[PDB]
Amino acid sequence: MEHKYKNHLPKIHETTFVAEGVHIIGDVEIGEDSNIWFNAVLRGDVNSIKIGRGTNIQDNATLHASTGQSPTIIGDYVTVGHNCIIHGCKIGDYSLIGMGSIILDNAEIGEYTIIGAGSLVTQNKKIPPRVLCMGSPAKVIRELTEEEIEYLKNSAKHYIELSKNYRHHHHHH
Amino acid sequence: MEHKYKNHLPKIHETTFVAEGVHIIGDVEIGEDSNIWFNAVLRGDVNSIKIGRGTNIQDNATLHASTGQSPTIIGDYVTVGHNCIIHGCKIGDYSLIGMGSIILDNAEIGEYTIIGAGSLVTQNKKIPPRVLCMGSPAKVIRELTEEEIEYLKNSAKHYIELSKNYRH
Amino acid sequence: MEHKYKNHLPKIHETTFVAEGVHIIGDVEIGEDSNIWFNAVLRGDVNSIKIGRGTNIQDNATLHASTGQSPTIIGDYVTVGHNCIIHGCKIGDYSLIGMGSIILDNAEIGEYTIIGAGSLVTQNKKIPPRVLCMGSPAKVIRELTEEEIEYLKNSAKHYIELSKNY
Ligand code: NA
Ligand code: NA
Ligand code: NA
Ligand code: NA
Ligand code: NA
Ligand code: NA
Ligand code: NA
Ligand code: NA
Ligand code: NA
Ligand code: NA
Ligand code: NA
Ligand code: NA
Ligand SMILES: [Zn+2]
Ligand SMILES: [Zn+2]
Ligand SMILES: [Zn+2]
């Protein structure tokens, strides 16, 4: 579902997959090949949400922001895990937010970074590119390996392929 | 959406805002200007849920309770953050439950208290009023400042304004 | 709702309770008297999900799995708490996953085990039967008492009875 808020209707690319039970409200922009999964809520009322190209927002997640704080800005080929809370933060390209994590206002996650499952990235926290960061409050643990970087090169692209299988549902018996 | 459970139909004030995807079941009472957000579940089957005036229950949250344990009692002008799990506990007026927190059966949160995001308030835990409490397990950190009290004086009221802007 | 994915239709027992707002997709099998609560998502697209008999999956939870990793296999009379994330793991009979917990790929929870609320069981972790395990990352704390075993013997049964009252 797409809902209007004041003078704002969501701007959703024609190639974006939106699963059932989703609510996208107001000032939300979602780029090509991005894919939004079951029961996710993307609420752009008090502030804006922008999602780039080829990014997945997984099931039961919530995206929001705060009046007068940073907008929610998510780059390209990002993976946001199931049941995440993404709140007024910036996430760089190719990064992965582990399922069940919480990212608070004005935080920034560099590109090609893994946030471990169940992490809490607190307000204003700055996380560099190419690291593993995890815990509550989350801390930078180590640099990613070449294999982990390669995994991030393609994790979102596999979700794009998965979402195309759903977009062609009416082309399957 | 409201659902009957046995003999119980939800008692929702005429001015309560309820977003889409919400399921409110059974013995649930919600007061004037309270506002319930997308995909929240308020399940009053095994015990009662009561929410006062001007309280927000944010998106993807779950409110439930347990047999023979404490009902869920939430006061006025309370903020319950996104994806919280609120279970058989008492929450005093003007308090804020940080997003993604879990509050277990028989816990009590005093009035004018902030629970930090991602906290776990354990069973039977009593958190005093006018403090910041955070962590898993959650611990009292310090008393709130008057600026934080003033924030709590208005956080729920700004949510009321927000809900009215949807023009339901 | 039971959504088809490619050639996979969910196989749901006639006695399985499924609440409103639920999305069950693809290669998902759910057995007799199991009960799936409001807004839960059970997504069997990249891998399968199997749930036995008398098991509850509570509100706002998500079950999923990963390509090339272990399927999600949940036994009989299991309790999965509200807003849990259950991912490519095996859960033994009569176990209880405390609300808001996360179980990652290839983990195994032994039967008659309690995972404390808000816990994280990491990938490939094998939790023995008949213990309490809690924390993030979760650790085994102690063996369960007879009182707690009795509680696990009745927890899912109470959810079966609750679901039938709907
Ligand atoms: Na719509
Ligand atoms: Na829904
Ligand atoms: Na959640
Ligand atoms: Na790891
Ligand atoms: Na993607
Ligand atoms: Na609505
Ligand atoms: Na909050
Ligand atoms: Na509890
Ligand atoms: Na096919
Ligand atoms: Na714990
Ligand atoms: Na730890
Ligand atoms: Na059950
Ligand atoms: Zn918010
Ligand atoms: Zn419950
Ligand atoms: Zn997954």
Residue numbers in the entry:
A (entry chain A): 1 to 173
B (entry chain B): 1 to 168
C (entry chain C): 1 to 166
Q: What does the literature reporting this entry say, word for word?
A:
The 16S microbial community profiling of a metagenomics library from geothermal spring at Lisvori (Lesvos island, Greece) enabled the identification of a putative sequence exhibiting 95% identity to the γ‐type carbonic anhydrase (γ‐CA) from Caloramator australicus (γ‐CaCA). These findings provide valuable structural and functional insights into γ‐CAs and demonstrate a strategy for converting an inactive enzyme into a catalytically active form through rational design.
Differential scanning fluorimetry (DSF) revealed that the enzyme shows high thermal stability with a melting temperature (T m ) approximately 65–75°C in the pH range between 5.5 and 9.0. The enzyme was crystallized as a trimer in the crystallographic asymmetric unit and contains three zinc‐binding sites, one at each interface of neighboring subunits of the trimer.
